[PDB]
Short mmCIF file of C-alpha atoms and ligand atoms in Angstrom, two decimals:
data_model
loop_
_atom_site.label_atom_id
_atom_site.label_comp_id
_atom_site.label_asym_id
_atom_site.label_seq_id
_atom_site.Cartn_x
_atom_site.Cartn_y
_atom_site.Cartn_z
CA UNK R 26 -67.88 181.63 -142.16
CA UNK R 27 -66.26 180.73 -138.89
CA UNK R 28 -62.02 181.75 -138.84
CA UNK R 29 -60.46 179.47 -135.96
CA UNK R 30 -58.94 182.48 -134.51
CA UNK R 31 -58.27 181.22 -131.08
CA UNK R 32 -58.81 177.38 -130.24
CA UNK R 33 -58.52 175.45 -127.18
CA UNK R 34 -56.94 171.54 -128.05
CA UNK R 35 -58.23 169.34 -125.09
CA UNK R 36 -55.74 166.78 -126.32
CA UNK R 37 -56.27 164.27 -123.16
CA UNK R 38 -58.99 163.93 -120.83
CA UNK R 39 -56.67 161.95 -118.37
CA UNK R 40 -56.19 164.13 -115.16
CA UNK R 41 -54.12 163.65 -111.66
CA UNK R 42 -56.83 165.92 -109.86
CA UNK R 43 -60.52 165.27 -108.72
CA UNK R 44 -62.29 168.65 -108.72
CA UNK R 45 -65.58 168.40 -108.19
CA UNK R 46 -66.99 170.40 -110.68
CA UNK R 47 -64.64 169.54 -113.25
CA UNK R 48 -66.34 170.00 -116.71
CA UNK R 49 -64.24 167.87 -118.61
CA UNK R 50 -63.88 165.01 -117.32
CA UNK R 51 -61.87 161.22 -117.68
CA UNK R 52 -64.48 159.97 -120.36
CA UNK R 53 -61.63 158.51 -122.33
CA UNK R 54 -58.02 157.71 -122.36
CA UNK R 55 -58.01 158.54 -125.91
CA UNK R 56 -54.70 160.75 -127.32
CA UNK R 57 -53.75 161.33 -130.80
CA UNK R 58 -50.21 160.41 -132.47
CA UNK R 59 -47.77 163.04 -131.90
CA UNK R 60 -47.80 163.19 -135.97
CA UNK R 61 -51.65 163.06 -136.38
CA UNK R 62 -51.59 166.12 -133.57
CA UNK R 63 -49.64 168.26 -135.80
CA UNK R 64 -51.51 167.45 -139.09
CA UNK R 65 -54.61 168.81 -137.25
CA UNK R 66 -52.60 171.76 -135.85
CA UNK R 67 -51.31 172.30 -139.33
CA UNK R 68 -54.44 172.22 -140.68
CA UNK R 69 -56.00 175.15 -138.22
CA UNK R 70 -53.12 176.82 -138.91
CA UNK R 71 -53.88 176.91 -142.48
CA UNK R 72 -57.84 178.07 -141.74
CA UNK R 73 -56.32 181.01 -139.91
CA UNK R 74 -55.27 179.82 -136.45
CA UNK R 75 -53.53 182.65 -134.25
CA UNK R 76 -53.51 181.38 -131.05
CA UNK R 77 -53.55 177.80 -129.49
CA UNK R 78 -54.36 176.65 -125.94
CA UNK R 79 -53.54 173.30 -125.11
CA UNK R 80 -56.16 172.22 -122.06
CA UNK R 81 -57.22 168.75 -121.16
CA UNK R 82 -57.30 166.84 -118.84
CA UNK R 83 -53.66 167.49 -117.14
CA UNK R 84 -52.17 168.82 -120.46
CA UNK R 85 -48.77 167.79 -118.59
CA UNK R 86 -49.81 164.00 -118.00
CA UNK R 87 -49.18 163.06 -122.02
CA UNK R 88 -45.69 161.32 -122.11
CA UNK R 89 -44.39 163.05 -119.43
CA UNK R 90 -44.81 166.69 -120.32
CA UNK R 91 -42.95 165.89 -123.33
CA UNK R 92 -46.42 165.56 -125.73
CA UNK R 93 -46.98 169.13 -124.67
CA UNK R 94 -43.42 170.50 -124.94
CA UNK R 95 -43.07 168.94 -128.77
CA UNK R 96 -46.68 170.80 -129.85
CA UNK R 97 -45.68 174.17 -128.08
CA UNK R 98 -42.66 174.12 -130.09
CA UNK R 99 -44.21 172.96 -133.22
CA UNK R 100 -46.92 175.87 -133.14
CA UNK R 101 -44.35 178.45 -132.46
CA UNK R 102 -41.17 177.14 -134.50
CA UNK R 103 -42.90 175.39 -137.48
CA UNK R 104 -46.41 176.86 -137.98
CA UNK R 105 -45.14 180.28 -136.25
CA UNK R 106 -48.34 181.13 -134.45
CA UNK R 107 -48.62 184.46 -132.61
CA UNK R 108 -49.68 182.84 -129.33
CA UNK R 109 -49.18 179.54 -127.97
CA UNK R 110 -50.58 179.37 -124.08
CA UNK R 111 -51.53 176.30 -122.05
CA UNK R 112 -54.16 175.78 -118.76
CA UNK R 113 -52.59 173.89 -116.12
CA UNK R 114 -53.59 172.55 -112.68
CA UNK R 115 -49.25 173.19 -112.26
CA UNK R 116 -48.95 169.44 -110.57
CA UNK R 117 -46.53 168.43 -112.61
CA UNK R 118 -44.50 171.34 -114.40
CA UNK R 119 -40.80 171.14 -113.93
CA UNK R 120 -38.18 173.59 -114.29
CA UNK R 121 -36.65 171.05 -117.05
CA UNK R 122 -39.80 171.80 -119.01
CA UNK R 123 -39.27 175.51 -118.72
CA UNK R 124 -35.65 174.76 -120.19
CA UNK R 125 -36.35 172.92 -123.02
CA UNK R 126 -40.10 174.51 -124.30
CA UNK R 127 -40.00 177.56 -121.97
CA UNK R 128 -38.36 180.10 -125.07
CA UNK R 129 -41.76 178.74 -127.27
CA UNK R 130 -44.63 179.35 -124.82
CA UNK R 131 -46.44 182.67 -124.95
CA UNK R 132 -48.53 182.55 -122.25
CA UNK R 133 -48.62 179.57 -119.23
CA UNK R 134 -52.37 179.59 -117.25
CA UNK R 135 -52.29 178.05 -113.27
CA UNK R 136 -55.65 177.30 -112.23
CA UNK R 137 -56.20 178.53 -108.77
CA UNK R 138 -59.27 178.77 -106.78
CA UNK R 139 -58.39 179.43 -103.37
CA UNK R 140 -55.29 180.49 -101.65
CA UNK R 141 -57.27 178.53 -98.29
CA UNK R 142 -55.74 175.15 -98.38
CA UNK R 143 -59.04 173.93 -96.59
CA UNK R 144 -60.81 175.27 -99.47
CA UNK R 145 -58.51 174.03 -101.85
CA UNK R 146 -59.26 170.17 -100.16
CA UNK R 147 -63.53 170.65 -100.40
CA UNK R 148 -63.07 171.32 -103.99
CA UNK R 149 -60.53 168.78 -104.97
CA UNK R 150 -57.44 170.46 -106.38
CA UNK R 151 -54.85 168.06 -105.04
CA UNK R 152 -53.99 165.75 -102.18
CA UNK R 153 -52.49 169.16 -99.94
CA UNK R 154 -49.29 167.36 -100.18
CA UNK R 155 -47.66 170.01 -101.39
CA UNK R 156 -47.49 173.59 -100.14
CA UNK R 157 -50.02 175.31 -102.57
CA UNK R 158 -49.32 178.45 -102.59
CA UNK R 159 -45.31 178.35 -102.38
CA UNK R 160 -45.84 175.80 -105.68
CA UNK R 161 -47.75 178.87 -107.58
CA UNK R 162 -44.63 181.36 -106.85
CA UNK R 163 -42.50 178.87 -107.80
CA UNK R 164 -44.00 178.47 -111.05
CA UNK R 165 -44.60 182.43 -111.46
CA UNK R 166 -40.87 182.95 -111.03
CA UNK R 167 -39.52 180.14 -113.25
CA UNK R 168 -42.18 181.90 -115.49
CA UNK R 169 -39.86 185.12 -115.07
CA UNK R 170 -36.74 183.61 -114.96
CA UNK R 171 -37.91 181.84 -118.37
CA UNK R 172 -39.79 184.94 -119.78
CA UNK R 173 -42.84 183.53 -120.29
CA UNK R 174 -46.32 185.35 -119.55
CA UNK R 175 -47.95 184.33 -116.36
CA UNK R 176 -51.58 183.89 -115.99
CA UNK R 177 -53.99 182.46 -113.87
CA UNK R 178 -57.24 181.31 -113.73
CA UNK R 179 -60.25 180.78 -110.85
CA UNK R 180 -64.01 178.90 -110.89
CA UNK R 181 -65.94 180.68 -108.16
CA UNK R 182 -68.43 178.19 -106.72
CA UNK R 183 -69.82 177.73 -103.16
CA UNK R 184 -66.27 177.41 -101.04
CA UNK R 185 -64.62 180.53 -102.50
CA UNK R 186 -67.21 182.70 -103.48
CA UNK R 187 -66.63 184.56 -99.77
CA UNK R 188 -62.84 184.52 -100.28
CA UNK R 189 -61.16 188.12 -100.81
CA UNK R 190 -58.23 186.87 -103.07
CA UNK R 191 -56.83 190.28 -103.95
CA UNK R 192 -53.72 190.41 -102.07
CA UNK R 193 -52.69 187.04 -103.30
CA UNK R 194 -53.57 187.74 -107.14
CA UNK R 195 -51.47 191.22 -107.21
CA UNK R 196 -48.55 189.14 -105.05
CA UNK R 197 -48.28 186.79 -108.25
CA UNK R 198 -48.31 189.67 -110.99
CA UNK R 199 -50.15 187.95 -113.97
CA UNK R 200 -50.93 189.38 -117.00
CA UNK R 201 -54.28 187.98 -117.18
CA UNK R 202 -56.70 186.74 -114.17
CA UNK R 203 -59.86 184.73 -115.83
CA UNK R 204 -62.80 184.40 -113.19
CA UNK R 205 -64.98 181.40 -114.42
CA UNK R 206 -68.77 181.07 -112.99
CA UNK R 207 -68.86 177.69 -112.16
CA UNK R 208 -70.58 176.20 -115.30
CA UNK R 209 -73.06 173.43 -115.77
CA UNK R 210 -72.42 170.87 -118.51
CA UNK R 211 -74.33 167.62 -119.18
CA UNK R 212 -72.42 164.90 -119.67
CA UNK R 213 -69.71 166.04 -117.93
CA UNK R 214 -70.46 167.56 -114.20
CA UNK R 215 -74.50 166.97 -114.28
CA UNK R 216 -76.64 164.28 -115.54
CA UNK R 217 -76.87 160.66 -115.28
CA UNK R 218 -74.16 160.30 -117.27
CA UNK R 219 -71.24 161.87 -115.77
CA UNK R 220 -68.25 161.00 -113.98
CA UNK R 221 -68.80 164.84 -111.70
CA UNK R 222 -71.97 166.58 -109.77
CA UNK R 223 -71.08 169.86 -109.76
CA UNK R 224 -74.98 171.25 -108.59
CA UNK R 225 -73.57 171.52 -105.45
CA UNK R 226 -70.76 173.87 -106.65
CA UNK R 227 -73.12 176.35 -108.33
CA UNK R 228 -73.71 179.88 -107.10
CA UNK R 229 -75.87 182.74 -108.27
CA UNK R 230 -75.05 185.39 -111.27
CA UNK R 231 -75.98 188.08 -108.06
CA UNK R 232 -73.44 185.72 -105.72
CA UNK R 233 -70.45 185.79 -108.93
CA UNK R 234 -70.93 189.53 -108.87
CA UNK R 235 -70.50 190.15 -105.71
CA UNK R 236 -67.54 188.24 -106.14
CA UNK R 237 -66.57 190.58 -109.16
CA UNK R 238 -67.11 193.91 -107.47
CA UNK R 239 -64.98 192.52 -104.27
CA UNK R 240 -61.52 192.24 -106.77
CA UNK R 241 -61.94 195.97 -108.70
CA UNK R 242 -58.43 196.62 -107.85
CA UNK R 243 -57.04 193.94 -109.96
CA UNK R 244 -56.28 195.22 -113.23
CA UNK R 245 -55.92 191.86 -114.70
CA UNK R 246 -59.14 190.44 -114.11
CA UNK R 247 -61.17 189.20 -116.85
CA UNK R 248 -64.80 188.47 -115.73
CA UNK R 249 -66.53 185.08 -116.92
CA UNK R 250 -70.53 184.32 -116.28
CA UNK R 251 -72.12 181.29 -117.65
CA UNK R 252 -73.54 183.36 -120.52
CA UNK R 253 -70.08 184.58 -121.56
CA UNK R 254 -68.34 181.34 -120.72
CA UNK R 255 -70.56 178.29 -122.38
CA UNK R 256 -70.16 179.13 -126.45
CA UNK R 257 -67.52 181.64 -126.42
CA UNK R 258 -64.54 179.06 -127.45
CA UNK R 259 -63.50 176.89 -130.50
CA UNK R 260 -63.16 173.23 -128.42
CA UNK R 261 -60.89 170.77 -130.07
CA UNK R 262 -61.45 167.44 -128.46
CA UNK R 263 -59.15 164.57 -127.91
CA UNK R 264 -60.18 163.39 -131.11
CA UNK R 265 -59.67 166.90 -132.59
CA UNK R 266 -63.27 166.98 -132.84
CA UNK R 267 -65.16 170.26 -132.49
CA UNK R 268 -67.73 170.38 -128.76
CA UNK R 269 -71.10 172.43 -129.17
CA UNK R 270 -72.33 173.66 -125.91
CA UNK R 271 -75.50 175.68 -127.12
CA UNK R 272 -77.61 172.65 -125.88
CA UNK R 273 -76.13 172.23 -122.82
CA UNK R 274 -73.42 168.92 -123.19
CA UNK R 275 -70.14 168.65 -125.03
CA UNK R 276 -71.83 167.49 -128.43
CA UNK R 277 -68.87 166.60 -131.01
CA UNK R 278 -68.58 167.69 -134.18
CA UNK R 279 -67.20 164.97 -136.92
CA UNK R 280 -62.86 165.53 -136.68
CA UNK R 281 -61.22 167.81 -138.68
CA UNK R 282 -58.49 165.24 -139.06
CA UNK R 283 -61.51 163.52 -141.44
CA UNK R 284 -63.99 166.39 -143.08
CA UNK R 285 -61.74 168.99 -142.63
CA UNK R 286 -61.70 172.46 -140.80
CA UNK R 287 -64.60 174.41 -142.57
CA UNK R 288 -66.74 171.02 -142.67
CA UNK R 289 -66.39 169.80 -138.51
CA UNK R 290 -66.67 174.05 -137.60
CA UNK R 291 -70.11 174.64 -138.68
CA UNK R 292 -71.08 172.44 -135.96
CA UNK R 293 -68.89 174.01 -133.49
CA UNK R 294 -71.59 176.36 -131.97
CA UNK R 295 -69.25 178.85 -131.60
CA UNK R 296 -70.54 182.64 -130.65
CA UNK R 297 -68.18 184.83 -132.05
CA UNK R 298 -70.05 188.06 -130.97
CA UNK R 299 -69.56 186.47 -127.34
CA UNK R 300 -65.78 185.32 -127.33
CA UNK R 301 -65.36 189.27 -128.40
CA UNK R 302 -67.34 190.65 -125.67
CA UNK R 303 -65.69 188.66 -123.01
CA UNK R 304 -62.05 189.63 -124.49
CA UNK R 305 -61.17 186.73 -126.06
CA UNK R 306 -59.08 188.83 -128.35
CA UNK R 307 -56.43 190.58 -126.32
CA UNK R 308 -52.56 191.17 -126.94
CA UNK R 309 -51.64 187.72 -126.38
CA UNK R 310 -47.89 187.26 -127.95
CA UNK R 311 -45.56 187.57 -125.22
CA UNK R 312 -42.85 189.38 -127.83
CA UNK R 313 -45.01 192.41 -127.87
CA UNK R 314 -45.63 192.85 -123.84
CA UNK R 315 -43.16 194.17 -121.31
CA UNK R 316 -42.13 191.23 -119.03
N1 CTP U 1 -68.09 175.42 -122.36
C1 CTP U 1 -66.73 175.44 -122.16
C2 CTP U 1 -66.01 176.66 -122.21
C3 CTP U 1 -64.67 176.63 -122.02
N2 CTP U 1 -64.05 175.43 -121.80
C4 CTP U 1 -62.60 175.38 -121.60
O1 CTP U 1 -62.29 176.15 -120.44
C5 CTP U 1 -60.94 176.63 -120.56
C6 CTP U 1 -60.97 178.12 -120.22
O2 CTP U 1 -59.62 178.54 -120.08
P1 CTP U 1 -59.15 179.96 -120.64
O3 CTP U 1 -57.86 180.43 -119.86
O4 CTP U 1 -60.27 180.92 -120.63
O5 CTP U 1 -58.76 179.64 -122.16
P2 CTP U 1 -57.97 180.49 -123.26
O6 CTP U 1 -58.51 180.11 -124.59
O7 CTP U 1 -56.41 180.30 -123.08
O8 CTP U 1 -58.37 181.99 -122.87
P3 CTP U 1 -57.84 183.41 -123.37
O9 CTP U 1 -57.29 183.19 -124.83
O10 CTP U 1 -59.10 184.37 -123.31
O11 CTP U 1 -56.78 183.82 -122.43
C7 CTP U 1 -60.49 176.39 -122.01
O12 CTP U 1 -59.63 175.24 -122.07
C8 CTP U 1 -61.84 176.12 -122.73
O13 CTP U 1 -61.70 175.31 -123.91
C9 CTP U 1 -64.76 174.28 -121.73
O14 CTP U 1 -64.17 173.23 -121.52
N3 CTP U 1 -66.08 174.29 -121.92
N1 SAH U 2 -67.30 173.56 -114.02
C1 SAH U 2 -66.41 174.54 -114.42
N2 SAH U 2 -66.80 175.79 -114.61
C2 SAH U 2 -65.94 176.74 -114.99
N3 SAH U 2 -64.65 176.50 -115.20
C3 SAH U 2 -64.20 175.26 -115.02
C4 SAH U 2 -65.05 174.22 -114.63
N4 SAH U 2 -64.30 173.07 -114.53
C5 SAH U 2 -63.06 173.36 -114.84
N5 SAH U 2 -62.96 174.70 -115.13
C6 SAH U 2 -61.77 175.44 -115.54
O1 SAH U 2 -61.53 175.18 -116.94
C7 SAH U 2 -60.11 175.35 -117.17
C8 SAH U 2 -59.58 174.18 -118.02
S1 SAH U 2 -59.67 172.60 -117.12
C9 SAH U 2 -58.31 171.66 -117.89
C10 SAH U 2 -56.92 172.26 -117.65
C11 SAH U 2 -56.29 171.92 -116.29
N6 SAH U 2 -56.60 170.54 -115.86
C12 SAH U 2 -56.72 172.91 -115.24
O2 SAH U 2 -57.49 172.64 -114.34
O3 SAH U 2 -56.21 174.12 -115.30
C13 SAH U 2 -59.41 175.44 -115.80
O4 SAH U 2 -59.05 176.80 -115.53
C14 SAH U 2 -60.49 174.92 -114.84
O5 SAH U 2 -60.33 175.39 -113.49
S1 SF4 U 3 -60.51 171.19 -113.49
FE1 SF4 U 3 -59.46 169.88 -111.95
S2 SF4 U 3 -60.18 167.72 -112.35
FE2 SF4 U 3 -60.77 169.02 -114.17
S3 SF4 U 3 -59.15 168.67 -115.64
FE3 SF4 U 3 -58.40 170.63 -114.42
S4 SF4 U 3 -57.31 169.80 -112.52
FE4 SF4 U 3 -58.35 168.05 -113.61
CL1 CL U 4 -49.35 179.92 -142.37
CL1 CL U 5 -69.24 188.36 -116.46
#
């Protein structure tokens, strides 16, 4: 009964950064063909795919960027999605990239969650050998010299949940802000057996709305808890398998590339009523907004 509207494709779980909460983690250096890739895409896209997020992992890491700059185009040239977006740490994103894939990416998500560059170091996003916040205008204007729909994203946890970031956000324009509660996930960031510890990250629903009611003024903000964060998305893995988080892991579904869509998504956990309430469905093809 489940239509994979809107799916996220963790297609590596190999990353360049060492966030401390990250919840998904280096548990494999597994990638799919190129070819095998698209047969799964092709076979969302027949199941009623809309929109695609590639996510990872450092979606950029695959072959260079190039891995993610053939998929882009093939979802928006051969399988003509509506939206094709990506979540990006922004390491490794090139201006090259931007002229070769740019014209076939909807929507391109920065994580940021601090504009403090001592912050930035307690939490793990990058070595500070590169000037942070310069890097995300750089990508926001290559995203407008490129016309492609700028977005970021932020986990509040313990080192930014203080930080008044509202300045900063409006200075970059995006069309969408996502605030993430940092989230708990065995297997990943809690448990024996996990490469991250992220209890030390964790703040209150009372501390994440404090946080909320601080950044009003941003029209773009789109507010995440733990309850609307843990089963509102369709989770491709790197072995295009389907995660359930309703019990509190990453538990995998069999792949789609072997039983098929309807088959592996029964087990997806997926709460539709939720991904609606948090706005999970939103104008999301950059053809019909004013860039
Ligand atoms: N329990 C969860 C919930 C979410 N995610 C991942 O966290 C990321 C959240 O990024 P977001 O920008 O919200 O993803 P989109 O699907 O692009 O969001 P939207 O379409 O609402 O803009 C996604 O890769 C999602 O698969 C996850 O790994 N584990
Ligand atoms: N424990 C956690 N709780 C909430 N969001 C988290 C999280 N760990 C990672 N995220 C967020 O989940 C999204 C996908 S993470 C993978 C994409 C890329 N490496 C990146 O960092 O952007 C990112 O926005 C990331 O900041
Ligand atoms: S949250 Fe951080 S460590 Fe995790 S995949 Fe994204 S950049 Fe890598
Ligand atoms: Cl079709
Ligand atoms: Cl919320």
């Amino acid at each position: 009964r489940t239509t994979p509207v809107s799916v996220n494709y963790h297609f590596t779980r190999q990353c360049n950064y060492k966030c401390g909460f990250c919840f998904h983690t280096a548990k494999t250096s597994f990638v799919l063909p190129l070819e095998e890739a698209k047969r799964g895409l092709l076979l969302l896209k027949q199941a009623g795919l809309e929109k695609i997020n590639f996510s990872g992992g450092e979606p950029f890491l695959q072959d260079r960027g190039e891995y993610l700059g053939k998929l882009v185009r093939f979802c928006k040239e051969e399988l003509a999605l509506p939206s094709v977006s990506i979540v990006s740490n922004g390491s490794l994103i090139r201006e090259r990239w931007f002229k070769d894939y740019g014209e076939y990416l909807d929507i391109l998500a920065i994580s940021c969650d601090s504009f403090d560059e001592q912050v930035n170091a307690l939490i793990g996003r990058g070595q500070g050998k590169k000037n942070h916040v310069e890097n995300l205008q750089k990508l926001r204007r290559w995203c407008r010299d490129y016309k492609v729909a700028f977005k970021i994203n932020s986990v509040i946890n313990r080192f930014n949940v203080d930080e008044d970031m509202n300045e900063h956000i409006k200075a970059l324009s995006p069309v969408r802000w996502k605030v993430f509660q940092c989230l708990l996930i065995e297997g990943e960031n809690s448990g024996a057996d996990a490469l991250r510890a992220a209890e030390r990250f964790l703040i209150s629903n009372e501390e994440f709305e404090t946080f909320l009611e601080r950044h009003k003024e941003v029209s773009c903000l789109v507010p995440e808890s733990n309850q609307k964060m843990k089963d509102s998305y369709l989770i491709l893995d790197e072995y295009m398998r389907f995660l359930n988080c309703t019990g509190g892991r990453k538990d995998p579904s069999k792949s789609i590339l072997d039983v098929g869509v309807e088959e592996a998504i029964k087990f997806s956990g997926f709460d539709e009523k939720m991904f609606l309430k948090r706005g999970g469905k939103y104008v999301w093809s950059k053809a019909d907004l004013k860039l």
